[PDB]
Amino acid sequence: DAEIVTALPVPLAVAGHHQPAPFYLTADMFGGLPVQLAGGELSKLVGKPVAAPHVHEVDELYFLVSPEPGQARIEVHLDGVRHELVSPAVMRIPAGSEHCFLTLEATVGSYCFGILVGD
Amino acid sequence: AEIVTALPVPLAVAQPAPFYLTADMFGGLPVQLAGGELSKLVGKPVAAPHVHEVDELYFLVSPEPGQARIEVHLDGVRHELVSPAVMRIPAGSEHCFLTLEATVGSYCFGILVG
Numbered sequence A: 001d002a003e004i005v006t007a008l009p010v011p012l013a014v015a016g017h018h019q020p021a022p023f024y025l026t027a028d029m030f031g032g033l034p035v036q037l038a039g040g041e042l043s044k045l046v047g048k049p050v051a052a053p054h055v056h057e058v059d060e061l062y063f064l065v066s067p068e069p070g071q072a073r074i075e076v077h078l079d080g081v082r083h084e085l086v087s088p089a090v091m092r093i094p095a096g097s098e099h100c101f102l103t104l105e106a107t108v109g110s111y112c113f114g115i116l117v118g119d
Numbered sequence B: 001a002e003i004v005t006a007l008p009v010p011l012a013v014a015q016p017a018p019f020y021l022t023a024d025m026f027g028g029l030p031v032q033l034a035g036g037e038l039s040k041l042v043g044k045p046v047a048a049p050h051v052h053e054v055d056e057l058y059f060l061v062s063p064e065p066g067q068a069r070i071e072v073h074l075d076g077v078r079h080e081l082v083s084p085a086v087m088r089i090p091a092g093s094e095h096c097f098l099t100l101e102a103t104v105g106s107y108c109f110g111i112l113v114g
């Protein structure tokens, strides 16, 4: 009766990303969604970027969260300017902006989610 | 740069729930997103059924797969979900969830879909 998805994450290729990105919401789920949502736990990603700088033609939000504030930190490169985000934080990356992030600090249970907004 | 750090945003929903994305952020968003860490939600024994006028997605995650577990009550049917899991609650459906098990760093996010 209910619509449940547990074949997760869905690996999808994203521009500049070395490996497929783990998606938990995709545009085709449930008859159609206005967002896609990818990302994961950061504790094993400190110092290791998941992508080269890249551009989308949709807006992307970085959602950085951790069990306690301040336990996670990423550096977002935005058109050659570096911004440090401290959990909890939400950053909007406008479509067409060159961008990527580097994990600076993360405990177990720190996440960064990328949310592609459908336009 | 557009960065929001005054988070979570306490909003009343059917206590205030902690929101990390609200509909008015960044000139308007097609979703709202609430939720929080589940390790401190294992202990309370009850949850209240409620209804929204939009679809809500439950998004259940944990640092390692299988480390978090909830019961989703949907119109009198009990569903036991294990992380990672996403469940769609159609608008108008009476629903709630109860946390059965969670390691530190497990989350359930409620995503209201416009």
Ligand SMILES: C[C@H](c1ccccc1)[C@H](N)C(=O)O
Pocket (backbone or CB within 6 Å): A014, A021, A022, A038, A039, A040, A050, A051, A060, A099, A100, A101, A112, A113, A114, A115
């Ligand atoms: C969606 C994708 C992503 C976000 C967070 C974690 C993994 C992958 C994004 N394009 C990016 O890395 O900026």
Ligand SMILES: C[C@H](c1ccccc1)[C@H](N)C(=O)O
Pocket (backbone or CB within 6 Å): B013, B014, B017, B018, B034, B035, B036, B050, B095, B096, B097, B108, B109, B110, B111
């Ligand atoms: C917004 C609220 C919530 C969802 C997930 C996590 C915390 C709070 C939701 N209405 C529900 O509990 O179903």
Ligand SMILES: [Fe+3]
Pocket (backbone or CB within 6 Å): A054, A056, A060, A099, A114
């Ligand atoms: Fe991106």
Ligand SMILES: [Fe+3]
Pocket (backbone or CB within 6 Å): B050, B052, B056, B110
């Ligand atoms: Fe709800």
